[PDB]
Subunit: 404 residues, 3 copies
């Protein structure tokens, strides 16, 4: 293959086709250079916000499109499938989600054992958010007992849109108008992400430039720990089921992985991960609208590995019970939101379970932002390969719907 | 009939059909037992909230479904009827609402005469809420001058949805798409209340268990006062108009009356009262979507009797003007919200009208919760019998629509 | 013409046809009389709010209908036009908007030369509001860095609805359902403004009555300055393009100009300006839904003249750089909101540009309310004549759509 590469054949065709994909890679390279060049800070945090503003605009655009996407996706997705067909596709997703989150936490504990307001209120608020008291409120607000904190209730909307799509599925002819209504809205918001995809290189540049303006050994532990899980463990899972090339599939969702390294939000990168699967990897719309929104807030393999490493790292300094780490890190992974720094916020639960003090989180916070950008990528990669595996396992159910 | 009852015939068929209805009755019996058994409180109010949490979840589910129900109901209801046909059905509802609220206040004053920030701002805020400045805000917020307090503006949504449904009625063919849109959404949210109906026994149990964790004579006055109005006065009104058995009709809405005793909210129990009339009592959808949402926030016969008893009870301790009590108690009844403890909040208006001090409300508050659960039932019973009476009086208008 | 007027012919026919238009003129005459008669104030501002309450209700009704109008208008408007056809109609609107705002600021500076938290944060917040992070939030909230202040994000909704309508235009057949959905909603909210049009005389009366309960020379400068621009400059622009009578056109939108003098909000008067053009002046719905919502928040000729006069008036007391006044007054005109007193709030930007102190705004505030009612009229007049000019310039594009 090395001798085959020195041919220097068709380089112009690659630059013309992957123009936007190369620009985002160029944005990361220029974003690290520009940020480190302007690293001596004679500027107030107020002036840092002005500097990272072109990246802040991209976030506003992405955060905008999440709500009409999540809602339209599940309502059409759960209506496109039959009562038993949705349960089978669901069980395939649940089995995949639980396995990948438990294998990540096992890899996380092994790698850290080789290389050296209440907790109950955090559980009740999750159950309170799964059942929102007002849907209009849920679209822009979340519950946090002291009462209703700012920011979208993604979980409550996924749960409602699921049941709502299933109810229209039972309605048939009457329910067809609303299913056709939400299918128009999904394609309408998808045609809107295509426009936002061109602003992305300008945004990502200033988004990472503004953020670069014993713990060192720990940083390597997670970063190395994620490379093993994401580039060796997860691609082999795809090859074992689909029997197809995983690194060719990972290349299609590169624009979704590069944006994750910028935003650090599974929810914010979801409208682009939808565009990456449905277009370049030619994944079925009926399953992307099924696996992708659920995996965004639940399938967090990168967080579960981070929750296992950072918890034991706290015990290393402070100087059976390791089984409860693998349980609560899996529990906090599914719980945690697909938004930035939501990895350390849910670490309160994993530390209290073993008896470790929660005041130790302050030590990690400083380097969190860099690991957050890497863990989001593993969370995006999980749903992306997660859709492809479900599609390959449910082609029989998909062929029955194509009859008409 | 006593000799006819000792037959012991078909007991298995009753347990299999009314399985869910018996479970809610069992939930009330178990809810009183469990609450009184755990009555010695070595637990903080924080721990009481944890105990009544399975009941708190049911409330979140019910409060959720009120907004898409109220909106879809009136828009289709006012569009299903003609310009003059809606005015006639309206006049039948208004006449029924005013009569039942004035007869309840007359029964209330008689029973209490036998057995021993500004008021203007409370009126202006009602007129401010009837015309909401922002519909999206109205869906989760209400006005309260100091500015816009938390909680749905049910009145503003009923008023807007009414006019909006009437405007589509005039639009005909163009307006048919939106009428067909909202009819899908109404049946979609109705299929969602069927699912919530199974959680109800688990909720109601902890909802009443958590709440049980001269004023004594007063408690009997209202409780006895409501039994006369609800079980003797109101069923005879149905028999005088429909010429049909009222206690057989009351049995159909038992799941709506039992839930009222738990939630204490006419709005929260409205999605279940809709399911009780449309199914078991086979009431027309065109009139339930017309009488039920309006009666939920206006027809409060149980509150009007409570407002008459509690006002004179305050004068009994403190030691012509009784005509103003019957007027303001009727005025506060129509005003007051279909939510818990909204009976004492509107008592400020009835006490200031006669000159009695508003600081006397503090005496009643302690026992209010128990009477609140009983008065809600009389408010639910009023709309339920209220729909059946309107349906019986408007069959000619209903037969004209069935031609097509 | 003077001899032709003494005929006293058909006076009964004018009172029967323009009954509502004469009532609003009568409301202004009675509103000035009633307000000045009750001018000796032995009443607290709390009692002033009670007095101006019948005008406050009209505002609640108007503010209500703006959000479903703005959203439905642009989505159908941008879908009714072709990709290149919307760009041409857009360029015609942009050219008209920039010319009228630059000619108003030139007239403003001439008339004042004959007759004697940060500024950057105000720019960033505009760019933050053009891209809203949550559409449900945008419908009732706006951004203001300290974080998200109360009141509708009109600009974010106009920008989203524009792109959304354009995306459905590309969708064709699939996108037709949603275009037909939003066309029903536009006509539904238009049939709702017809009802609010009858409350208008009662509202306008108390709206202006409550508001009348060197700076004197300055007041005349702007008032005279607006009469030249609005009644002499702007009608001649219409006559130069359309070749039709402008004062006959101004008569059709009189109910929209009289309401502006009451509300002082281009957004609040927009649902009535829509009813005035589409009915009395028989303007095409495809262009009113295009020019009117954009012009409401951008085309502010009355504000640009006010921003030029009041800035130089501040320099007159305090005792090349005049070019920056004409630039920033145009910049603040497009920026400023179509709501009351938004003329002095954006004056911070025009005063800082030349070096003048922002603390001088306190001097003008006292008389602002009267000039605000007059400048809103010039902003309403600008969009109204602005639609008629675009319609006359784009009849070829309109005739192609009428083929079907
Ligand atoms: C709590 O966190 C979740 C929510 C969802 C899921 C699965 C999933 C994915 N991915 C999607 N899109 O739909 C369904 C799933 C089911 O397991 C069940 C499946 C289902 C099948 C049949 C009837 C249903 C009725 C209502 C809701 C879901 C239903 C839907 C997994 C965990
Ligand atoms: C203020 O508190 C209320 C609101 C509503 C009602 C009545 C009602 C009930 N129940 C329902 N569903 O609709 C109408 C009612 C009318 O009286 C009038 C009726 C009506 C008839 C004809 C045209 C209308 C146009 C707009 C609104 C209502 C209209 C509608 C009574 C009191
Ligand atoms: C920033 O403040 C504004 C926003 C809008 C406008 C113009 C306008 C008016 N009036 C309306 N109704 O639509 C469009 C305009 C364009 O210039 C462009 C035009 C347009 C043409 C072709 C494709 C488009 C795609 C997305 C958005 C607008 C598009 C739409 C002017 C200034
Ligand atoms: N940043 C992660 C969540 C986390 O903070 O753990 C994501 O968005 O996927
Ligand atoms: N609880 C009553 C209202 C009240 O408190 O008076 C209801 O919801 O019907
Ligand atoms: N009152 C003006 C805006 C301003 O205050 O300048 C309008 O609504 O058009
Ligand atoms: Ba089907
Ligand atoms: Ba019809
Ligand atoms: Ba077309
Ligand atoms: Na997983
Ligand atoms: Na998660
Ligand atoms: Na009544
Ligand atoms: Na009421
Ligand atoms: Na202009
Ligand atoms: Na403006």
């Amino acid at each position: 293959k090395k001798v085959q590469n020195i041919t220097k054949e068709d380089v112009k065709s690659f630059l013309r086709r992957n123009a936007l994909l190369l620009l985002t890679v160029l944005a990361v390279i220029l974003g690290v250079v520009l940020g480190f060049l302007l690293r001596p800070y004679p500027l107030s945090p107020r002036e840092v916000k002005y500097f990272a503003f072109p990246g802040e605009l991209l976030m506003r655009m992405l955060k905008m499109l999440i709500l009409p996407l999540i809602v339209s996706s599940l309502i059409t997705g759960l209506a496109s499938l039959d009562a038993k067909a949705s349960g089978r596709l669901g069980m395939r997703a649940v089995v995949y989600y639980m396995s990948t989150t438990i294998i990540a936490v096992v890899l996380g504990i092994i790698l850290v054992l080789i290389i050296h307001k209440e907790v109950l209120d955090c559980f009740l608020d999750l159950a309170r958010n799964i059942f929102p008291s007002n849907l209009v409120s849920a679209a822009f607000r979340s519950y946090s007992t002291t009462q209703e904190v700012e920011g979208m209730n993604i979980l409550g909307l996924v749960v409602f849109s699921m049941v709502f799509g299933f109810a229209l599925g039972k309605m048939g002819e009457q329910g067809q108008l609303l299913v056709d209504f939400f299918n128009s809205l999904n394609e309408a918001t998808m045609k809107l992400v295509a426009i936002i995809m061109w602003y992305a290189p300008l945004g990502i540049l200033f988004l990472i430039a503004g953020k670069i303006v014993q713990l060192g050994m720990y940083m390597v532990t997670v970063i190395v720990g994620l490379v093993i899980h994401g580039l060796i463990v997860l691609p082999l899972i795809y090859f074992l089921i689909t029997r197809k090339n995983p690194f060719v599939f990972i290349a299609g969702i590169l624009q979704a992985l590069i944006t994750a390294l910028g935003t650090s939000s599974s929810s914010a990168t979801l409208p682009i991960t939808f565009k990456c699967l449905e277009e370049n990897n030619g994944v079925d719309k009926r399953i992307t609208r099924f696996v992708l929104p659920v995996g965004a807030t639940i399938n967090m393999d990168g967080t579960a590995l981070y929750q296992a490493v950072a918890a034991i790292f706290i015990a290393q300094v402070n100087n059976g019970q390791i089984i409860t780490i693998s349980i609560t890190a899996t529990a906090a992974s599914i719980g945690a939101a697909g938004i930035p720094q939501a990895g350390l916020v849910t670490m309160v639960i994993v530390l209290t379970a073993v008896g470790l003090p929660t005041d130790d989180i302050t030590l990690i916070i400083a380097v969190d932002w860099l690991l957050d950008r890497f863990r989001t990528m593993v969370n995006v990669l999980g749903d992306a390969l997660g859709a492809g595996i479900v599609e390959h396992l449910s082609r029989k159910e998909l062929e029955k719907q194509d009859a008409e």
